Design a protein around this ligand. Structure first.
Ligand code: NA
Length: 240
């Protein structure tokens, strides 16, 4: 029956594509999650790299399309806390790249259009409008590299757009405290005196501008509005 979408940023893209046709259902906000999947006609999830607990049900479900495994996205590898790439890995934070958000939109339009050909014209026009909005937002950024640190490495896909230079991360896993060695490493390798530090929430490294940036967009109802706010907050942190 309905489109089901694992994550909130991907649910906000799905909402624009389906606007005026149907309402997608966010899965992760259990057996109620299970019920929504059995009843779904299409399930969009990032894939076993982003949701390892969901992997069981969705990996073997023919209506479930894993965006990371589709070959539609610009995929970047994971990085260590010093910015080196890890071989054969995939950074899952793909939606912060505006071109990836657009690719996700046109892919959703194509998937739902095959299932409901009676709404094909509106699924594709929404994808066009979402694409126009996302690209207009991105063209506001054209400039020298801007260094920045993150608490953990969640913003790699925002760097092409805002010309950010990754100077390192405090921890490889947000559940692991940063080491005194990594803090010292970052402090002594400082590209600049005042360093922007991005983290998920407000909740020894020296002179820093601390800016919370929620890639998951949890308190937003429009993807491009959410992206424009993340981008302008990030740009001000790195230029201040
Ligand atoms: Na790209």
């Amino acid at each position: 029956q309905g489109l089901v979408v694992s994550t909130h940023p991907i649910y906000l893209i799905a909402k624009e594509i389906t606007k005026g046709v149907e309402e997608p259902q966010l899965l992760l906000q259990t057996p109620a999650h299970r019920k929504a999947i059995n009843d779904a006609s299409l399930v969009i999830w990032l894939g076993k790299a982003h949701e390892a607990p969901l992997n069981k049900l969705l990996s073997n479900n023919k209506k479930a399309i894993a965006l990371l495994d589709s070959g539609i996205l610009s995929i970047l590898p994971q990085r260590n806390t010093r910015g080196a790439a890890l071989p054969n890995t995939v950074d899952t934070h793909v939606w912060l790249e505006p071109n990836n958000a657009v690719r996700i939109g046109f892919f959703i339009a194509a998937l739902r259009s095959q299932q409901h050909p009676e709404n094909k014209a509106k699924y594709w026009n929404n994808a066009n409008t979402f694409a126009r909005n996302m690209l207009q937002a991105a063209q506001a950024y054209d400039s020298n590299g801007k260094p920045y640190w993150s608490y953990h490495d969640a913003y790699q896909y925002l760097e092409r757009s805002l010309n950010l230079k990754f100077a390192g991360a405090l921890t490889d896993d947000p559940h692991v405290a940063p080491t005194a060695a990594q803090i010292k490493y970052l402090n002594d390798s400082r590209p600049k005196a005042q360093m922007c530090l991005l983290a998920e929430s407000f909740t020894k490294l020296g002179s820093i501008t601390f800016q919370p940036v929620d890639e998951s967009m949890n308190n937003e109802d429009n993807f491009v509005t959410a992206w424009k706010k993340l981008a302008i907050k990030t740009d001000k942190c790195v230029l201040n």
